[PDB]
Input
Amino acid sequence: MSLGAENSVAYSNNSIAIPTNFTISVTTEILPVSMTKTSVDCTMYICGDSTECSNLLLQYGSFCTQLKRALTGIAVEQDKNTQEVFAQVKQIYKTPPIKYFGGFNFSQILPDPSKPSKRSFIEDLLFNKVTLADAGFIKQYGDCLGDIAARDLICAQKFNGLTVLPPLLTDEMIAQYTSALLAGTITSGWTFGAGAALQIPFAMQMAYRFNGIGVTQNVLYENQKLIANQFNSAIGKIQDSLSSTASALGKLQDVVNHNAQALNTLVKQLSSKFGAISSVLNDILSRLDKVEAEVQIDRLITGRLQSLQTYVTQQLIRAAEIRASANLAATKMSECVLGQSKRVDF
Amino acid sequence: STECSNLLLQYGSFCTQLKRALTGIAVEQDKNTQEVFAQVKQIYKTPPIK
Amino acid sequence: AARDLICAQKFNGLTVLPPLLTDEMIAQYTSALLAGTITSGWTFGAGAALQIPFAMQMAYRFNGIGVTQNVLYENQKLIANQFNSAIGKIQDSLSSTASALGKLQDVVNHNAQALNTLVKQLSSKFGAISSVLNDILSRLDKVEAEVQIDRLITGRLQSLQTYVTQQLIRAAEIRASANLAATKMSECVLGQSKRVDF
Amino acid sequence: RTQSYTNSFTRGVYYPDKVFRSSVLHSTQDLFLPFFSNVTWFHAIHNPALPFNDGVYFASTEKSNIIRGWIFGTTLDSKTQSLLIVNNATNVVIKVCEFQFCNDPFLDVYANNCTFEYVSQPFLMKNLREFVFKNIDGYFKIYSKHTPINLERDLPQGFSALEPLVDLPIGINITRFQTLLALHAAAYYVGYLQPRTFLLKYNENGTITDAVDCALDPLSETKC
Amino acid sequence: TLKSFTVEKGIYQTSNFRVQPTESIVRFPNITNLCPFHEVFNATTFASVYAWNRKRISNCVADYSVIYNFAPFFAFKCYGVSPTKLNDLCFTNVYADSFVIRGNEVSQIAPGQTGNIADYNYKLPDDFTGCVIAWNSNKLDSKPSGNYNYLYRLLRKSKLKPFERDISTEIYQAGNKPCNGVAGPNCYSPLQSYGFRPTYGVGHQPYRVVVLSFELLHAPATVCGPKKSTNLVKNKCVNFNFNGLTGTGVLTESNKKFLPFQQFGRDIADTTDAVRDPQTLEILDITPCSFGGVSVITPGTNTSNQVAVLYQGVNCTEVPVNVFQTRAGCLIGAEYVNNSYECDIPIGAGICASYQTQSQSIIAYT
Ligand SMILES: *[C@@H]1O[C@H](CO)[C@@H](O)[C@H](O)[C@H]1NC(C)=O
Ligand SMILES: *[C@@H]1O[C@H](CO)[C@@H](O)[C@H](O)[C@H]1NC(C)=O
Ligand SMILES: *[C@@H]1O[C@H](CO)[C@@H](O)[C@H](O)[C@H]1NC(C)=O
Ligand SMILES: *[C@@H]1O[C@H](CO)[C@@H](O)[C@H](O)[C@H]1NC(C)=O
Ligand SMILES: *[C@@H]1O[C@H](CO)[C@@H](O)[C@H](O)[C@H]1NC(C)=O
Ligand SMILES: *[C@@H]1O[C@H](CO)[C@@H](O)[C@H](O)[C@H]1NC(C)=O
Ligand SMILES: *[C@@H]1O[C@H](CO)[C@@H](O)[C@H](O)[C@H]1NC(C)=O
Ligand SMILES: *[C@@H]1O[C@H](CO)[C@@H](O)[C@H](O)[C@H]1NC(C)=O
Output
């Protein structure tokens, strides 16, 4: 591999280098904040409406209670993560009807009134780019009962006792929060994150933001069309970057893919015999007497309980990782959007 | 042992997920090293004068 | 000579992979960051590298912390001597005591002892009559050997699952420490931080 | 007669089980046809016994009444009881007794003491038909699919599933296989089977469209 | 569910509702024949072990309770099936094998045994799902001079495959000098007489062994036990017993294009979803009836005892075993108001619930 290009910078004890112009660049940072919420019925997954399987499962104690408690804690934590990341204002600010901001146009990030959802252009490309699994966050028993085409994976997950809960905050409320934050940071500067929102012209806020990094404010006022054109070109290149490449949102795509694959593996774990004579419980009931089928049922119960505990442990570890990423996203939301940060590469 | 493998295959996919977890950790170690150290674009060489 | 622990670890199916970046590449990256910090200062991490003599860079670092830059040019030799004495003291302290690297030694020792315990767990019977699989294969008929092999398989699968869970938790902790180290690399070396005790 | 050893070029697979699966990939361990095998293109105008070892099939493109007769068995004529399945347009005469044959077998146009005489459906009718004579657990499951060959040549490229139709169990020892063409130029193929793991591509109708062999090349092992 | 007498404010997942079945239907093929067990068990003279007879039993009603009357054995030893439950389930084909052995080599007829009978005369497979029966026959199978009629093979070149027969009586050659029909040194006859005698010990009496080989159910179901069939029902959560495969579900008309060899239909979880009726050639889809999560939305017991119930993920025109339709199930017992407050008890997609005053009742709001 190559570590990089070779550069020999010219150093001397009486030589200085000073820039004579500037460029304005717009980058993109993507952070996952939450994943899908899953609720698991252990009795329908292990037994499947068999009475003596339930009677032999009551002997094993309170494994089902603590696994259900862990999954309920994960489902609460996802909504808590989304709430602490996005909800950071007491008031829903609204942009003025005039769209002049000193030469900078925010028409590609402010919401449009034509669409039923209050999502902007770039948010529309972000939601169209990520291919969701289309799980049971909408009700699907009508589609599962009606036999159309073939058997879906999600219908099998629903029939085996695995249920996906919908999130507390809809996409419209998230878009409303994002639009309020954008309108606040466009009009009022950073003053809306520290109390009452105080209005200011955008060119004068831009002069303050150049003053905060060490450049005098007369540089902006003498060149304001150039900063405006550079900002417009920089925010226009994000459109052409997001309209073609589909590899930018791989973190959110992997967040979807891992929670799909774990449920698929948990469903596929039902087809193994676990050392018994059959993987179907009703064949064991119909084929054997009391004691021998009790032995085979105990083997199947231990195997399915081990599979379910493995799934719960993996979901707990992934929930800890997602919570760490959500805390990082909340810190980046507080310090970059609501103010100006002097931390390098933050 | 052929018989041990043939009876281990009856336990389902209790090993593919183990290999997937170990592969994820092995990828994450190199990702950590690349994140910490590879933070420069060009290799800078010090001048011969000291 | 004698059978090593690593030879038994390899013979039992436990393999250690090499990292992608060798130590020469890590040393080259560290040397590049050092040369950029010495010559440019903080401007090599915010765009193009702009040269500056080290006295004026040190004066800018003094102007960052709130002391006026005329106390450097009047006390340059004393500051150079203090920095050289500090570097020599760090060299002497690293040559004297090796107990500062205890966390890196723990990172080595944990994955050493986990693999050693994973090898040592193969000597257990787990309720069977023998820990050797070939003894059960050659001593019993099909059904009884299938029962004892099932017991041994359950025990070894449980031990492997415990090892994988412990490795996942340790990997999460190592990832958190690596993210902290990356933040310290971006904020202390490529710039000057105002955060207290960071 | 003259024999030639050609290649099958990834052709020949059957339905593993007797259940219905829709839109899923399923892996089965069974005596399967090896991809890129070494089949034999036998030529005969006037036939020894092939060393049958845990799997065999059949493929021929001929028409009329010349393509018939699939006599199995270890030894013919007398002595050891062996299977002598004979075939014509409408009858299959299952017998464990041996017909009074000789060193040269022939079917005249113009047996012994039998233990199991069974009469069932006939096993036959540019059409290169394929037939499987797999032997496992003494069952002799037979799979077949009509494959109309476009251009008369060697075995083409395709993964058409051969449907199970025939299940006639003969639990005896069979190591050889002769053939009983009508005697009054034949492009019939002889191949082999082997225990190997597959991974079949189903659909919403239940037809095997694609099939990968998990031991052909390492890319297919990665796919499996 | 919470194992406590007082509950706090919030939403709790308690249990699950499920529509219980009300009818049971049993579908068996229309067969009338009686299986020939009497011609197998009650015979004058059985064949020897090297030449055991095979009898196919199919297309008849099999009654396994008359087996005890035909022969005076002790127990009906089986491996893959319990001896208790033969009659309710049913199989594809039944095979009968019979031979006469000694009393020592009885345990060798079992899956995975090594000896003389198991290695050269009669070997059972690795996975046997049939039954083996043996009883003493000292009164009908012994003479004072000796019973020379039955033979066993003592030497063979290789062990037999499972379910194999070796009838050939050529002179076994263990040396280099050819036999050529002469029985001399290393030219031994394979078959040796048992030599039964009534004054033997307990381990040396002749024992008649009958093997009831069973194969599991497949596309044909020719032999099945005695059970009265029931008329088919559709579109109701009922218990179905299709050829011994018990379960619960709803039978609907199907559009699946089954091939003529196909009989069942399996999903990714390896359970039956499509069945073929043995009487009328048609395919029925099997799906479970209405079920789902049940959540309890309550304030504390210090405040009130009024409870709203959220049936999760159902289009609730089918409630039973105020009503507001939610994207997260639907509410029963909580009215919807045209207001907007802060979220007290979360429910679902932007919908919460709270306990208020303006007659106190539980309301639901966005
Ligand atoms: C400054 O650098 C030049 C060469 O670059 C060197 O000759 C001179 O000695 C340096 N100044 C001092 C004070 O060392
Ligand atoms: C900002 O962009 C929008 C859409 O690209 C455009 O209609 C508008 O004229 C632009 N405003 C300015 C000041 O360039
Ligand atoms: C089949 O075997 C013959 C034997 O010589 C060989 O020449 C030919 O290449 C083989 N064909 C294959 C491997 O496809
Ligand atoms: C039975 O078949 C096997 C094939 O492995 C063969 O070795 C054996 O000789 C055959 N037995 C007889 C009696 O032909
Ligand atoms: C399945 O069968 C239908 C029958 O009309 C056909 O239209 C469709 O193309 C088939 N799908 C395949 C072969 O993938
Ligand atoms: C056995 O069959 C014979 C002839 O059918 C009959 O006389 C005899 O009573 C039968 N034995 C029993 C025990 O039924
Ligand atoms: C059994 O019933 C089916 C349909 O009712 C019928 O076609 C068939 O002939 C019946 N079997 C007999 C033996 O009559
Ligand atoms: C299912 O729910 C949708 C959403 O409210 C509704 O439009 C539809 O009528 C429902 N289906 C019924 C009640 O059958």
User: Anything to note?
Assistant: DSSP finds eight helices and no strands in chain C. The longest helix of chain C spans residues 142-189.
